[PDB]
Design a protein around this ligand. Structure first.
Ligand SMILES: *N[C@@H](CC[S@H](C)C[C@H]1O[C@@H](n2cnc3c(N)ncnc32)[C@H](O)[C@@H]1O)C(=O)OC
Ligand SMILES: *N[C@@H](CC[S@H](C)C[C@H]1O[C@@H](n2cnc3c(N)ncnc32)[C@H](O)[C@@H]1O)C(=O)OC
Lengths: 61, 56, 59, 61
């Protein structure tokens, strides 16, 4: 019907320790990609200070 | 396509985007895994159709 | 956060996401520059407020 | 009002040559980041065959 499906999600009251763990986030984000059936092209994760994590996983079919 | 995440530990908040293409890829499966991994207690999700066939 | 783009040259279509944080960062100039550079003749844009203060815990 | 502002955009009837130019797209995306006043953290662009281009510019404040 459409070329892609896009979920815009807001997550509240998360495990704050998990949210500020750049390595864990990369692991989960990458498994999430696997779980969805997608093929990962590349991924880049960065950690902010005093806290915060940003990550992107580029995919394909 | 992308799967992105931006966290605000100070607020226990995370902005997540799951954009997938293809019949054979399910963004809700990615969602389910992250909801579990982050232990989110409350979530709000809007599903967008990107590139509607009747539009392109 | 991110600025992202996924193009389908065969359809003259591009899926663009402009996600910025902070009052001093305007996602609309990023939009303005891209609409120009890609020469799009028609666009549809949805603006989301990510992490609303009243939803997280500011007030 | 909120931590971030996010524009989910559909661009139609674009210059098809530009859409399939990974070099130009990266250039224009970084410039757009600049025009917005955002700080660039990282940038990664992929060229798909026979055609198509994916790219992400992770930014900050
Ligand atoms: N993250 C998206 C990526 C969308 S891509 C950029 C769309 C363009 O790429 C071409 N293309 C060639 N081969 C592929 C494969 N295997 N998957 C997707 N797109 C491909 C398209 O023809 C189009 O021009 C995503 O695919 O999410 C999973
Ligand atoms: N792309 C977003 C990035 C959102 S980040 C992941 C939010 C978290 O990062 C912390 N942080 C620390 N220093 C900064 C700066 N300079 N900018 C943004 N966020 C920062 C926050 O406290 C939070 O935990 C974006 O900022 O878009 C422009």
């Amino acid at each position: 019907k459409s070329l892609g499906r896009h979920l815009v999600a807001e997550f509240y009251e998360c495990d704050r320790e998990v949210l500020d763990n750049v390595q864990l986030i990369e692991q989960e984000m990458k498994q999430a990609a696997y779980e969805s059936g997608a093929t990962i092209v590349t991924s880049t994760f960065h950690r902010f200070l005093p806290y915060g994590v940003s990550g992107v996983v580029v995919i394909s079919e | 396509x992308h799967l992105t995440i931006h966290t605000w530990p100070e607020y226990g908040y995370a902005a997540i985007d799951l954009f997938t293409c293809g019949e054979d890829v399910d963004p809700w499966k990615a969602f389910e895994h992250l909801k579990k991994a982050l232990k989110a207690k409350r979530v709000h999700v809007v599903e967008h159709e990107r590139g509607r066939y009747d539009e392109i």
